[model samples]
Target chain A: NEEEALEKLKKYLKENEKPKLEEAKKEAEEKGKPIVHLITVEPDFPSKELLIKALTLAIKFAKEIANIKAAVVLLAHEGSREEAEKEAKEIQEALTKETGIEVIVVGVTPEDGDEEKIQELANEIKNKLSKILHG
Target chain B: KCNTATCATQRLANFLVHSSNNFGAILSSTNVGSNTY
Candidate 1:
């Protein structure tokens, strides 16, 4: 039954298309112009309902809030940090390969005060993302 | 609009629009799904 659920999930994932993202390297052709794919995965939001909520928010932001070429996502109920990172990497690879856009996964730390750290995290992420999309 | 795509006005406008969009969508979706008869 679990396998069957996963099989269905896999099929859904295959058809889940918002749009193709561009590779990071191809994002910076014009100075000060680049497509930034900001993907936020809320650790605490794991249920299908929550997952859809998060993605819907992200998509809404991507289209209206910023000049994003595309967006990607992954939500797990429980997982180690290492596992999350690995999954993020896989998502990034797919985003880059499929869209030619820069993909950055922002893993939401589980804590009430974590929201305060978003700017700091954004800075560090921006740097790494710059390297990938530009250099 | 500006010399670059990173112009502060453009960025701000974009952010404002996005925030509004997300907020509205969230509200609308939540309202639609809040029904339980």
Candidate 2:
């Protein structure tokens, strides 16, 4: 399982992945919503203040456009369960209400081995992007 | 109405063509760590 996930992550980082873009185009054409691929994967976890600013800029631009919808996918490391859950909800609320982006937060809990965090996040990004795009 | 094939497509393509404006600041921004810029 780990090996397959690792391979998928490697492939994803190398490609703007998921169902072939041709399929996407056909679907977009049929649905009458032009599908644009725009995904940014941070090199590292941004500090809270920096992340807010980065997303603020994105939202401002999206605001200038009409009929565009977007969402944010977040990955957090688990610590004390109660404390981590609290911040997750707070940040989700802050960013959602403040900027109008739906934020989906997933945590790497105790069973998620420490060494595989980067690979895991990459895989999560791929999954979330597809869900947001075609769901 | 978003009465397209023509209309929504035009809006999405317009957004795509000029999406670079969104990240222009990050490309030329000051990188100082002491305070927010």
Candidate 3:
């Protein structure tokens, strides 16, 4: 069932997902820039709902307090980090290919403090992206 | 107005507008379901 389903997904992935991304990439090249790493912040915020709540707070605080356009991205998995990485890689390959964009998925853990580390990441990414967009 | 494809920087405003909007579509794949650690 699983492999059969993935094959169907693979078929549609090309037809559905990859094409849209490629089109968007074309628009990006003719009209814009690109993407980079997807970093998930690890805070033992407890569970599903809390992670969103905390992340919502992170982006809100970063936007209002830190003055950045902040957002959160989550990656899901069926198994090990190895599996997730491999799956993410496959998707990344499809998304990138001729696009000249890179999307690397990673998780960031604070050495000790949670909020501070998240704030740093938001500010850091702003600088990383801003240098490209600024006039 | 920096409309040409060569004006990569000016094109970013619209590019980034669409950029984050599409992640949901990409991540919705069955292979890409999430789990809280």
DockQ of each: 0.04, 0.02, 0.04
Model 1, span A1-135: residue lDDT tens: 333433443343234322222222233333335444434243333343434443444444444534564443422213344665675565455445544444454332232113233345434544564565445
TM-score (2 decimals) of chain A in model 3: 0.31
Distance (Å) between predicted and true CA of A111, model 3? 20
Count backbone clashes in candidate 3: 2
Clashing pairs in 3: A76-B33, A76-B34
Q: Of 1 and 2, which scores higher on lDDT?
A: 2
Model 2 alpha-carbon drift over 4 Å, by segment: A1-27, A33-46, A59-66, A78-84, A108-135, B1-37
Deviation in Å, model 3, residue A62 alpha carbon: 30
Off by over 4 Å in 1: A1-35, A41-78, A112-116, A132-135, B1-37
Quality of candidate 3's docking, in CAPRI categories?
Answer: incorrect
Angstrom error of the Cα, residue A17, model 1: value is 12
Report the lDDT tens digits of candidate 3 across residue range A1-135.
333533443454446444444554454455444423222333233444443333333233223322322222323333344664564455444333422333333232212123344345444434544553452
TM-score of 3: 0.30
